Amino acid sequence: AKGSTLIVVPFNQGSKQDVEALIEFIYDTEKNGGLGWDLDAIIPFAAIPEQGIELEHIDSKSEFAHRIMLTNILRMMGCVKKQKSARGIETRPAQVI
Amino acid sequence: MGEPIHKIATRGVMLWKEFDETIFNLPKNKLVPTLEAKRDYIISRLNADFQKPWFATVNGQARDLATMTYEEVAKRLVELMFIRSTNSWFDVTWRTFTGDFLRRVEERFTKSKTLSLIQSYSLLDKPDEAIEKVFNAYPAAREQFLNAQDIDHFLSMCQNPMQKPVPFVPVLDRRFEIFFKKDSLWQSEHLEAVVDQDVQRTCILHGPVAAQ
Amino acid sequence: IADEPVKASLLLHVLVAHKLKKSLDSIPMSKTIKDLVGGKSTVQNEILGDLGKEFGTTPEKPEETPLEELAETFQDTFSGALGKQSSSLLSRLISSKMPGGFTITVARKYLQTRWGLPSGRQDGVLLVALSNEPAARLGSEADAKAFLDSMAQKYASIVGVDL
Amino acid sequence: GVATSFSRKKARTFDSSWNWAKQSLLSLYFEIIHGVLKNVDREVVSEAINIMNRSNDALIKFMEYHISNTDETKGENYQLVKTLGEQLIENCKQVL
Amino acid sequence: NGNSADAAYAQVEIQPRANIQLDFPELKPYKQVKQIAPAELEGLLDLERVIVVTGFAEVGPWGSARTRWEMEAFGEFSLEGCVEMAWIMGFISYHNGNLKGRPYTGWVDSKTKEPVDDKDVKAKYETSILEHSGIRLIEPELFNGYNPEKKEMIQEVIVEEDLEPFEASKETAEQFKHQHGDKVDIFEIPETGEYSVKLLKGATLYIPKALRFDRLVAGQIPTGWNAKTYGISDDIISQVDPITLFVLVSVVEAFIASGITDPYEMYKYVHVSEVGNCSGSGMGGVSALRGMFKDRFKDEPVQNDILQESFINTMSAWVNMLLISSSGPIKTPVGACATSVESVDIGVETILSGKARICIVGGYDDFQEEGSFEFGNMKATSNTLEEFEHGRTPAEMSRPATTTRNGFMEAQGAGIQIIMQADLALKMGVPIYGIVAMAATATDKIGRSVPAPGKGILTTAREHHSSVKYASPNLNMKYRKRQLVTREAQIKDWVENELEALKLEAEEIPSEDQNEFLLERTREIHNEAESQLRAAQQQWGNDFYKRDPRIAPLRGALATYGLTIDDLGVASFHGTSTKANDKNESATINEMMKHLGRSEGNPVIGVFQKFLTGHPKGAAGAWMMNGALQILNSGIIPGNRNADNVDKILEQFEYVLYPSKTLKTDGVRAVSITSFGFGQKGGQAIVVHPDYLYGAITEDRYNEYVAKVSAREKSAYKFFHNGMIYNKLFVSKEHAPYTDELEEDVYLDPLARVSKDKKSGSLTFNSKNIQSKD
């Protein structure tokens, strides 16, 4: 719709450095090479399917999946808290769904 | 094979004799250029006098396979290979030949995988309604000359050995002698299956001396 | 093996073939140059200039007579000496298509050694090699050796020699 | 798995709604004339919404012209597009 | 119940065979085509001054105009398209004979010789076809081993210490001695008689080094494309620059699209001096230029006549020498990216000046290493390494009017159109794909940047608006028709008065010579009545706005056919995918539309075909014209599927719409084609829907035309399918239609015409039809 924008970026939520870089990209100013945005909402629905993997089968793929679906969702939030604090932003919280 | 034969001097055998003297004696290298040169004469004589007419003829006008529509071709097949008096196909292999051609027509003019309209060649035992049905599903085939691939496919079906020879010459090429002379003895005993029911087209074997 | 000076017939055939960039067999001996180059008027007098400064004297109106008697009319005077065109073409063949280090002297030595061909036959095999120019660059000695072998076979088959 | 995929240079931006509005309308207008979308189709209301959500003075004049130069006598589908048009132009004027 | 009870149940499936069509324009009934054009049009136009596109073709990254159009409009191949692509690329070849015992008739895989069904072509080859067509990584095997990742150069070094002596012939040793002077020593070898060459200290050598070039992607003709597949012989293929092969195929394929299977047929209708070739290139045979500038320098073996093959006018020469054998005008333009529009401008005027009645128009350009490198150095082309850094794939590197556009994609190919007088097109019964309403060129202005696009072409919309209170009666078609009717009555009086005056003069001539006198003077009055009517029609129908500075050439061109500025539906943009070009062309079309009073809210729909094909330079506008005619005769307007995000700067241009998806419309009436060459070559062309012509003739003449076209179409489909399966679309003329004795007799008789010879069956000039009274 009018005034909407869509920005499609390649991204591995598995990668810690991708998470830091993505948030540091959204929050950089246009001159420095970013969007100069300030997030109002974060919807972290990134997931990889695990089927047939019971407790005795928990291996690399599961430990990775767990980094995508928990650890790096805390790093995304942490990064968004660091950037807002850095820029002294205390009245525009980012809603995490 | 070049064996002499006593025949009644009908127009057809006169034609045969003429071609033996003027066409079929020529060496293999000069055969094709002579046929090309004499094409319009050869086609007129076949159509007037011989038991195997020029296939590619519409309303008496000497066309070619390449300049005939799929509807023109199907109607000519039914006109040469289906007997109106006995209301049957002279040979069942001829009926197959005609069906094979109608299935080819549906193949050429359908946009997607479909069912044949001619599911069994028994439907052709009423040929006019079968033609009308095929050329109503595919009316583009009424207006388009034969695809060069379908000309080649037709000529291929005319040389099928598990089939009674076709009652017509489809092409003037190196194999004109085989198209002209093959399977020439049945017509005298089945005049219903000859173009005008004309005996004068046919070959009748008969001794000069026993003819007294 | 017995020495035999290259026939004006073979030289003529190789020079025409090479100049048209066509296989040595494709050109039939019993046809005028004018029929081979029907269109191109440039390549006509270019072949005539090449045959001029190869065989010195040329017959009057040479381009509308078949290569049969042209070979004979040249052979009458021609004394199996490669001349200028064929020497320059063989130099170019060697320098532009050989392994490297493998020169014309080493090719001739290799022919004289393995196939036991004297200077007459060497000229002939090399002219056959020219007609079948690898049009690239022979990689190793082994490739050039194999190439010279296959050329010596063709030359022998043309002249009628056994190996 | 942990191989980096993200690069600033690979970021693709979509923001040309002003252009897509006119394309969307035109595609609807021809889909109704060709009788691909009927008067009962819910995708006619979905495309209305999408065109109202992008309404401006360029889109309103684009719609006015294309609708006020539709000859309704040419067919049923032309009367249908001209009726739905005139409505959509009123809607897009109210939500400018 | 056995297996015989379920055999009558079992039912036959018909698989489709590809039935490729020449997509001739559909001809409506006279009643429907009379309604689109005003009733006053009939009789108004001088049809000898109306130019039509009778036939077109191209060779390009997506094959032919047929296959390109399927890829452009629909984003995917049909059965017909897929089969056609597999035939072009050489994946399938026809077979009619014995194949492993059984007799076979159809397509076979060209390598295995295994039978292939048409239905299976997409499952078997579509992936290969898509992988090896269009804009794609440069294939070395198509460009004489050129690899931009390993681009050969030579660096000059000075020797510091003597080289191992090498063997060389006497001649080449003297040549080494001549160059190097005292810095080399050549000694004869007494044993064998060749020479040793020793380069000393201070000698100059060149050592090859390889540069990594950053332009890795181009619009290349599909891999497998061979002139032999169309029937061009090996002795032509060896002789000519590869560009010429593209021209020769485009010209036969254009003639086929025109329904002219034998070009000599044209000479039944027009003199040999009335068929022009108005086509051109930007750079000509760049493979031959390489030959003479690089390969000759490197002492590589190059053909002696390589010069002639390089000239831009040599491709048109070969077309005359192998197909057409005309003696008509030959006017080869060189307009860089605007070449193909300049070619139409020239060919239109060649026909309107009476010099020719048919022109071959279009353009052609090759892609080779040196031009690719030089375009990179001018930063004209997209840098492919930057595009990879931005995650772009090769298919999406040409993206005109997009925010991120950063240079054009170089392509190669040709595009040809046959144009002729409407009068002759109707008389021959050739198809008519569009009317060329207007074709113009413009320079820009005083500057110092040869590649800078300009706004000179804006002049095609030049109009005086000082005093526009009352509409001029000249735009009203009824007024113009009324003036022509007045004039037609005065011409009728003039013919009565010449015929009575001829009767008065006939009495003085003795009765034996009176017949010949009356024949010679009646013919002359016939000629001069024709001429005066055609001049009336010209002055009121065709050229009513040449002396009017209140009518833009662009407005007048459309008003001729009853159309208005609002009826210019589609603008085919040059749209190279460069920063400067795409803004400047938008801005230009916008000003034209705004000046001519185009209705607010009626933008022209932009078509950017170069998102698919890339920018082939010379041929650019010839592709755009071939797409414009396909837009007109279909009503389908293709979307720029690489228009991810339209540049925000372009929003200010309200009279332009940049679609990303194909719109199936209910009819396009007219298409503008704009090109912008290097060296201030601006160009425009207007093509009008062909149904606006038939309003200007009567029902009997229309119905005669429709019967002729129907017949000619059927003949051309027969020719095309035969030629395709037996690789003989192209058939070189061995001999001219005249002998060398008749040559001067035919050149000097304007009414000489070819006649069907009975013996050969070919179209020749007979001696009886030369300076004949009949």
Do E581 and E574 contact (CB within 8 A), yes or no? yes
Q: Cβ separation of D4 and A64 shorter than 8 Å?
A: no
Nearest to E229 by CA among E115, E90, E59, E92: E90
Q: Residues near B145 by Cβ (< 8 Å), separated by ≥ 6?
A: B66, B67, B68, B69, E714, E717, E718
Helix/strand/coil for E201: coil
| Cβ contact D–E (≥3 pairs, < 8 Å) | yes
Q: Which of D23, D25, D64, D66 should be substituted to probe chain E, the one whose Cβ sees the most E Cβ atoms within 10 Å?
A: D23
Instruction: For residues C14 and D89, give the distance between their C-alpha atoms in angstroms, rounded to a whole number.
Output: 84
Helix/strand/coil for E464: coil
Q: Give C40's contacts in chain E (Cβ within 8 Å).
A: 239, 305
Nearest to E605 by CA among E663, E689, E691, E690: E663
Helix (H) or strand (E) holding B130: helix B127-137
Calculate Rg over the CA atoms of chain D. Answer: 18
Nearest to E677 by CA among E206, E339, E332: E339
Helix/strand/coil for C159: helix
Q: Residues near E83 by Cβ (< 8 Å), separated by ≥ 6?
A: E18, E20, E92, E107, E118, E121
Instruction: For residues E765 and E15, give the distance between their C-alpha atoms in angstroms, rounded to a whole number.
Output: 49
Instruction: For residues C52 and C74, give the distance between their C-alpha atoms in angstroms, rounded to a whole number.
Output: 11
Helix/strand/coil for A9: coil
Query: How far is residue E605 from each of residues B182, E573, E631, E658, measured CA to CA in Å?
Result: 66, 10, 11, 6
Helix/strand/coil for E559: helix
Instruction: For residues B77 and B73, give the distance between their C-alpha atoms in angstroms, rounded to a whole number.
Output: 6
**Burial of C126 by CB count in 10 Å (0-12 exposed, 13-18 middle, 19+ buried)?**
buried
Do D56 and D25 contact (CB within 8 A), yes or no? no
Positions of E strands within E239-278: 275-277
Q: Give E106's contacts in chain B (Cβ within 8 Å).
A: 149
Instruction: For residues E91 and E107, give the distance between their C-alpha atoms in angstroms, rounded to a whole number.
Output: 10
Instruction: For residues D60 and E95, give the distance between their C-alpha atoms in angstroms, rounded to a whole number.
Output: 60
Q: Residues near C47 by Cβ (< 8 Å), separated by ≥ 6?
A: C15, C16, C19, C33, C37, C63
Instruction: For residues A55 and E173, give the distance between their C-alpha atoms in angstroms, rounded to a whole number.
Output: 83
Q: Measured between alpha carbons, how far apart are the two ends of chain D, in Å?
A: 48
Do D43 and A28 contact (CB within 8 A), yes or no? no
Encoded tokens for B100: 């094979």
E427 vs B: CB within 8 A: no
**Burial of C58 by CB count in 10 Å (0-12 exposed, 13-18 middle, 19+ buried)?**
middle
Which residues of E are marked as active site? 337, 574, 615
CATH architecture, domain E147-213: 2-Layer Sandwich (3.30)
Instruction: For residues D22 and D28, give the distance between their C-alpha atoms in angstroms, rounded to a whole number.
Output: 10
| Cβ contact D–B (≥3 pairs, < 8 Å) | no
Helix (H) or strand (E) holding E108: strand E102-109
Nearest to E148 by CA among E366, E365, E373, E396: E373
Do B86 and E742 contact (CB within 8 A), yes or no? no
Helix/strand/coil for E400: coil
- Residue D4 has φ and ψ, to the nearest 5°, of -65, 130
Do E572 and E627 contact (CB within 8 A), yes or no? yes
E130 vs B: CB within 8 A: no
Nearest to E588 by CA among E599, E601, E575: E575
- Residue B210 has φ and ψ, to the nearest 5°, of -70, -10
Q: Cβ separation of D30 and E666 shorter than 8 Å?
A: yes
Tokens 């000082």 sit on residue? E466
Q: Give A37's contacts in chain D (Cβ within 8 Å).
A: none
The number of beta carbons lying within 10 Å of the beta carbon of residue D36 is: 14
Q: Parallel, antiparallel, or unpaired for β E570-572 and E670-677?
A: parallel
Instruction: For residues E134 and E397, give the distance between their C-alpha atoms in angstroms, rounded to a whole number.
Output: 12
Q: Measured between alpha carbons, how far apart are the two ends of chain B, in Å?
A: 29
Instruction: Could you please state the CATH topology (level 3) that the domain comprising B55-171 is classified under.
Output: Transcription Elongation Factor S-II; Chain A (1.20.930)
Do E558 and E688 contact (CB within 8 A), yes or no? yes
Q: Residues near E444 by Cβ (< 8 Å), separated by ≥ 6?
A: E452, E453, E454, E455, E456, E680, E682
Q: Cβ separation of E305 and C103 shorter than 8 Å?
A: no
Q: Cβ separation of E657 and D19 shorter than 8 Å?
A: yes
Q: Parallel, antiparallel, or unpaired for β E663-664 and E656-657?
A: unpaired
Encoded tokens for A44: 């972290």
Instruction: For residues E364 and E221, give the distance between their C-alpha atoms in angstroms, rounded to a whole number.
Output: 13
Instruction: For residues D78 and D81, give the distance between their C-alpha atoms in angstroms, rounded to a whole number.
Output: 5
Tokens 């997009």 sit on residue? E402
Q: Measured between alpha carbons, how far apart are the two ends of chain E, in Å?
A: 82
DSSP string, D25-92: HHHHHHHHHTTSS-TT-THHHHHHHHHHTT--HHHHHHHHHHHTT--GGG-HHHHHHHHHHHHHHHHH
Instruction: For residues A75 and D68, give the distance between their C-alpha atoms in angstroms, rounded to a whole number.
Output: 56
DSSP string, C41-63: HHHHHHHHHHHHHHHSS--SS-T
Q: Give D15's contacts in chain A (Cβ within 8 Å).
A: 4-6
Helix (H) or strand (E) holding C153: helix C141-159
Calculate Rg over the CA atoms of chain B. Answer: 18
Length of chain B: 212
Q: Which chains touch C (3 or more CB pairs under 8 A)?
A: E
DSSP state at residue E459: G
Q: Cβ separation of A2 and D5 shorter than 8 Å?
A: no
Compute CA E643 distance to the chain's CA centroid, rounded to the nearest angstrom.
26
Q: Parallel, antiparallel, or unpaired for β D12-14 and E51-59?
A: unpaired
Q: Which chains touch B (3 or more CB pairs under 8 A)?
A: E
E206 vs B: CB within 8 A: no
- Nearest residue of A to residue D55 by CA position? A2
Do B202 and B51 contact (CB within 8 A), yes or no? yes
Q: Which of D5, D10, D15 should be substituted to probe chain A, the one whose Cβ sees the most A Cβ atoms within 10 Å?
A: D5
Q: Could you tell me which CATH number the domain at E467-551 has? A: 6.10.140.1410
Encoded tokens for E669: 């009436």
- Nearest residue of E to residue B144 by CA position? E714
- Nearest residue of E to residue B115 by CA position? E13
CA angle E621, D62, E563 (to 5 degrees): 55
CA angle E117, E121, E123 (to 5 degrees): 115
Helix/strand/coil for B103: helix
Q: Residues near B122 by Cβ (< 8 Å), separated by ≥ 6?
A: none
What are the start-end ranges of the H helices in chain A? 16-27, 60-66, 72-86
Instruction: For residues C26 and E404, give the distance between their C-alpha atoms in angstroms, rounded to a whole number.
Output: 57
Instruction: For residues E396 and E640, give the distance between their C-alpha atoms in angstroms, rounded to a whole number.
Output: 11
Nearest to E649 by CA among B86, A91, D18, C3: D18
Instruction: Could you please state the CATH topology (level 3) that the domain comprising E11-146+214-466+552-774 is classified under.
Output: Peroxisomal Thiolase; Chain A, domain 1 (3.40.47)
Experimental method: cryo-EM
- Nearest residue of A to residue D56 by CA position? A2
Instruction: For residues E68 and E220, give the distance between their C-alpha atoms in angstroms, rounded to a whole number.
Output: 13
Nearest to E341 by CA among E56, E574, E664: E574
Q: Give E724's contacts in chain B (Cβ within 8 Å).
A: 148
Q: Give A12's contacts in chain D (Cβ within 8 Å).
A: 1-6
* Sheet-wide strand order for E195-199: E166-168, E195-199, E184-188
Encoded tokens for E472: 């001029």
Nearest to E211 by CA among E441, E379, E377: E377
Instruction: For residues E696 and E706, give the distance between their C-alpha atoms in angstroms, rounded to a whole number.
Output: 15
Instruction: For residues E284 and E414, give the distance between their C-alpha atoms in angstroms, rounded to a whole number.
Output: 11
**Resolution for this model in angstroms, one decimal place?**
2.8
- Nearest residue of E to residue B111 by CA position? E16
Calculate Rg over the CA atoms of chain C. Answer: 16
Tokens 């092409």 sit on residue? B171
Nearest to D64 among E601, E658, E660 (CB): E601
> What are the residue boundaries of the structural domains of chain B, listed by start?
1-54+172-212, 55-171
Do E418 and E356 contact (CB within 8 A), yes or no? no
- Nearest residue of B to residue E13 by CA position? B115
Q: Residues near C24 by Cβ (< 8 Å), separated by ≥ 6?
A: C13, C14, C17, C128, C131, C132, C154, C158
What is the three-state SS of C76-114?
A: CCCCCCCCCHHHHHHHHHHHHHCCCCCCHHHHHHHHHHH
CA angle C124, C130, C135 (to 5 degrees): 155
E7 vs B: CB within 8 A: no
Instruction: For residues E627 and E336, give the distance between their C-alpha atoms in angstroms, rounded to a whole number.
Output: 20
Helix/strand/coil for E754: coil
Tokens 């009652």 sit on residue? B167
Q: Cβ separation of D34 and E651 shorter than 8 Å?
A: no
Query: How far is residue E55 from each of residues E327, E419, E687, measured CA to CA in Å?
Result: 21, 7, 13
Instruction: For residues E174 and E181, give the distance between their C-alpha atoms in angstroms, rounded to a whole number.
Output: 10
Encoded tokens for B39: 């094409």
Instruction: For residues E660 and E409, give the distance between their C-alpha atoms in angstroms, rounded to a whole number.
Output: 19
Which amino acid does the sequence have at A50? E
Q: Give A4's contacts in chain D (Cβ within 8 Å).
A: 15, 17
Instruction: For residues B201 and B181, give the distance between their C-alpha atoms in angstroms, rounded to a whole number.
Output: 13
Burial E79-100 (b: 16+ CB within 10 A, else e): bbbbbbbbbbbbbbbbbbeeee
Nearest to B203 by CA among B187, B192, B191: B187
- Residue E208 has φ and ψ, to the nearest 5°, of -55, 135
Residues of E contacting chain C (CB within 8 angstroms): 167-169, 171-172, 189, 192, 194, 235, 238-239, 299, 301, 304-305
Helix/strand/coil for E93: strand
Nearest to B114 among E14, E119, E725 (CB): E14
Q: How many CB pairs under 8 A join C and E?
A: 32
Q: Residues near B164 by Cβ (< 8 Å), separated by ≥ 6?
A: B91, B93, B94, B183
Tokens 């820029």 sit on residue? A87
Helix (H) or strand (E) holding C67: helix C67-75
The number of beta carbons lying within 10 Å of the beta carbon of residue A34 is: 16
Burial C65-85 (b: 16+ CB within 10 A, else e): eebeebbebbbeebebebeeb
Q: Parallel, antiparallel, or unpaired for β E434-442 and E51-59?
A: antiparallel
The number of beta carbons lying within 10 Å of the beta carbon of residue E513 is: 10
Helix/strand/coil for B176: helix
Q: Give E304's contacts in chain C (Cβ within 8 Å).
A: 42-43, 46
Instruction: For residues E34 and C49, give the distance between their C-alpha atoms in angstroms, rounded to a whole number.
Output: 69
The number of beta carbons lying within 10 Å of the beta carbon of residue D74 is: 12
Helix (H) or strand (E) holding E564: none
CA distance C91 to chain E (A): 6
Do E620 and E410 contact (CB within 8 A), yes or no? no
Do A75 and A44 contact (CB within 8 A), yes or no? no
Query: How far is residue B59 from each of residues B63, B68, B194, E667, measured CA to CA in Å?
Result: 10, 12, 17, 41
Helix/strand/coil for E753: coil
Helix/strand/coil for A48: coil
Nearest to D32 by CA among D20, D15, D16, D44: D44
Encoded tokens for C83: 């001349």
Helix (H) or strand (E) holding E387: helix E384-389
Nearest to D13 among A7, A17, A60 (CB): A7
Instruction: For residues C129 and C120, give the distance between their C-alpha atoms in angstroms, rounded to a whole number.
Output: 15
Helix/strand/coil for E168: strand
